[model samples]
Target: MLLYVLIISNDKKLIEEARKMAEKANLELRTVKTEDELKKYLEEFRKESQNIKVLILVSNDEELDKAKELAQKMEIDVRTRKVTSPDEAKRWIKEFSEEGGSLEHHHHHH
Candidate 1:
């Protein structure tokens, strides 16, 4: 299964750190600076790769909520976590890979 890590943040430092971590883990990383970009990316990916697992690292509460809503609506397997630091971001990626990219750790809000 393909694993995609979407880092939604306007912080250049955070985005760069996430990109490095994702690359080190050999996971595809996508950076979206705004909610619109994140939504558009999700829409495109949903149509192109429905089977892929998505891990979303959101920078703020608003984006996290929006991402969850979009993921559920799109019927995609998406797990979201708030990005606080570079270490946390790397840890999430490591945990995701260690868990075999399963959605078991993902919390779904209905």
Candidate 2:
């Protein structure tokens, strides 16, 4: 439940959607209401090291989105999606890490 990756966002719609995807994907999702929090939370977030991240910034620009770079120094695989599915999340980690190339466990079920 703590592995793979976690969803981070503030939108209720995307939160519900992402959470459901997280459920299907067996991942974790976190909710919060910030710039410094993003940095500080991510600092606390990736303490586990192997967990990946998904950011949902549906309508925003730079200047307030430096968390992307912050996650960079840590060499973490961070992605931004407005609204999407978890199959890709599973596929996303395929290149990032994971031992066997066995994605069959989750696909056929969906």
Candidate 3:
């Protein structure tokens, strides 16, 4: 499985932590500045890879909406999380890749 997680966070420490965790899980962690960059990454990956799962760390509503819109258009699964702790973020990353676990089931504001 080709897993791509777009972690959109201004926190450098958090992003670095995410990269480490992603490395342990053998996932490709991408730090994106804008929604366009994320979308472009997804599109390019989809073209090359057969199985691509996108997990988006949306810090704000604008990014969430953009992710939702992209998910709707592509009919691909997308997960949004507002993470306060690194552990919680890692948990979401694990859960998102689970079989039969759709992004629709995980949605909470914290």
Candidate 4:
């Protein structure tokens, strides 16, 4: 399966951690600082592969809308998953790639 994840986050440390974990899972992770960058990456990747493109958006309404548009344009399967940190993204990435059974920590910020 040609699975890849585009992590749209501006946080340097968060994205950096995710990038490494992404590699650990033997998957390609695209760091998107903005929606425009994401648009370009996805549009370009649409050519090479698409077993299923998994994207994690950091609660950006505008980018989410743009993402929907791109998915429609490419005519490919798409879905949005939730995760506050890259560790969560990695957890999902592992599952998305294959199997990862275990518990991960969570928190409540108010």
TM-score of each: 0.85, 0.50, 0.76, 0.70
Using TM-score as the yardstick, the better of models 2 and 3 is: 3
lDDT score for candidate 1 against the true structure: 0.80
Candidates ranked, most accurate by TM-score first:
1, 3, 4, 2
Clashes of 1: 0
For candidate 3, the 10 contiguous residues with the lowest summed lDDT are: 101-110
lDDT of 2 by residue, 1-110 (tens): 13333344455665565456545655544554455555665666567755344443322444224545555555554553332544443344443234322232221211
* TM-score, candidate number 3: 0.76
Return the clash pairs for model 1, or none.
Answer: none
lDDT of each: 0.80, 0.45, 0.70, 0.62
Candidate with the larger TM-score of 1 and 2: 1
Off by over 4 Å in 4: 50-52, 57-62, 99-110
lDDT of 4 by residue, 24-50 (tens): 887778877766876677677777664
3 versus 4: better TM-score goes to: 3
> What TM-score number comes out for model 4?
0.70
lDDT per residue as tens, model 3, 5-73: 888778888787777877877777788888688777767776755655678776676777777677656
Clashing pairs in 2: none
Report model 2's TM-score to 2 decimal places.
0.50
